[PDB]
């Protein structure tokens, strides 16, 4: 019942101001934080060699798209290697992001690890030396972070263990970020894998998010200096029932209204298995939902911002402008969608 304040008013202001910039009206996040292995797969799919140079050029292509993206992009999240790369003109990539009005983010987790005695469930590692890593990343230009937890809907899953453990590790990560002037994005990703319906996903989302916020309270997390990164509430990928975008919007907004305190600055959605267009249409329907929404409801999109741009590039420097156009189109669509404006004795002891 005793306060030992984690943060001063100055630290709170600093974190809250950063969180608000990222999710400011009309803005969302470009998730450009694929690991070297994931991005190798991206390059392979377009017949391009996985060299550091091709990775660097591909990231330059996204980061140096013209000024039409500036009102669209509040934040750009990077993987470790990219934080230390440079554009052709010699500017560090963080400087490229900042000059276009973007906040720089860093993915800080060290991947999922199996939870013994579960049906293929995971937790996430990456807490070791995280404080010193955060302090260094702050100095190197990052103001927000991402830590990804993964949960799966199945017959016995997510188990009581997987929920408790993933919510706890998210709170530990968030606590360390906030000590270093870094806004933690809290990402409890519930996979769309399986044949479960919309109602089941809504139920699981409600239970997972109630555990997340209880853990954040237990660990003294300052919610105003945080963002939330969930999946939308959708049927599973193998579900045969069809749903309108308005039903997805209603299930999503209802689940968030029941669990997410209004102090949380913003919700930056994953797009799961959605196409670029579907991701934008669903985000738009969420923002049009006729229920009170006391937080920003926006995007943190990777593939949903990048898929057409990656294809149009095709590893060809000649296709730079055509590839950037595809990315600009998605940034413009999503910027409108996050505003609801998108139209495609031993007894003494």
């Amino acid at each position: 019942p005793h306060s030992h304040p984690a943060l001063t008013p100055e630290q709170k202001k600093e974190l809250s101001d950063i969180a608000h910039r990222i999710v400011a009206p009309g803005k969302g996040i470009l998730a450009a934080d694929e690991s070297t292995g994931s991005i190798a797969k991206r390059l392979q799919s377009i017949g391009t060699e996985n060299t550091e140079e091709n990775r660097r050029f591909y990231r330059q292509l996204l980061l140096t798209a013209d000024d039409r993206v500036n009102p669209c992009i509040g934040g750009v999240i990077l993987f470790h290697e990219t934080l230390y790369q440079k554009a052709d003109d010699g500017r560090p990539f963080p400087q490229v992001i900042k000059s276009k009005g973007g906040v720089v983010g860093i993915k800080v987790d060290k991947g999922v690890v199996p939870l013994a005695g579960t049906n293929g469930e995971t937790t996430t590692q990456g807490l070791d030396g995280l404080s010193e890593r955060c302090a260094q990343y702050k100095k190197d230009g990052a103001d927000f972070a991402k830590w990804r937890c993964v949960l799966k809907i199945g017959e016995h899953t997510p188990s009581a263990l997987a929920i408790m453990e993933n919510a706890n590790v998210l709170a530990r990560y968030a606590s360390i970020c906030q000590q270093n002037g870094i806004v933690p994005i809290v990402e409890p990703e519930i996979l769309p894998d399986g044949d479960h319906d919309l109602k089941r996903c809504q139920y699981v989302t409600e239970k997972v998010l109630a555990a997340v916020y209880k853990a954040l309270s237990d660990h003294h997390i300052y919610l105003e200096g945080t963002l939330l990164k969930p999946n939308m509430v959708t049927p599973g990928h193998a579900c045969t029932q069809k749903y309108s975008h308005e039903e997805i919007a209603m299930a999503t907004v209802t689940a968030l209204r029941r669990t997410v305190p209004p102090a949380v600055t913003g919700v930056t959605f994953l797009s799961g298995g959605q196409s670029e267009e579907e991701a934008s249409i669903n985000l738009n329907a969420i923002n049009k939902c006729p229920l009170l929404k006391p937080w920003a409801l926006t995007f943190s999109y990777g593939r949903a911002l990048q898929a057409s741009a990656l294809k149009a590039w095709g590893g060809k420097k000649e296709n730079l402008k055509a590839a950037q156009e595809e990315y600009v189109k998605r940034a413009l669509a999503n910027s409108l969608a996050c505003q609801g404006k998108y139209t495609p004795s031993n007894h003494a002891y």
């Binding site: 998730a31 690991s35 292995g37 994931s38 799961g272 298995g273 593939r303």
Partner: peptide, 7 residues
């Protein structure tokens, strides 16, 4: 493996 890019 990547969940966002691999379905």
């Amino acid at each position: 493996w990547d969940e966002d890019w691999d379905g």
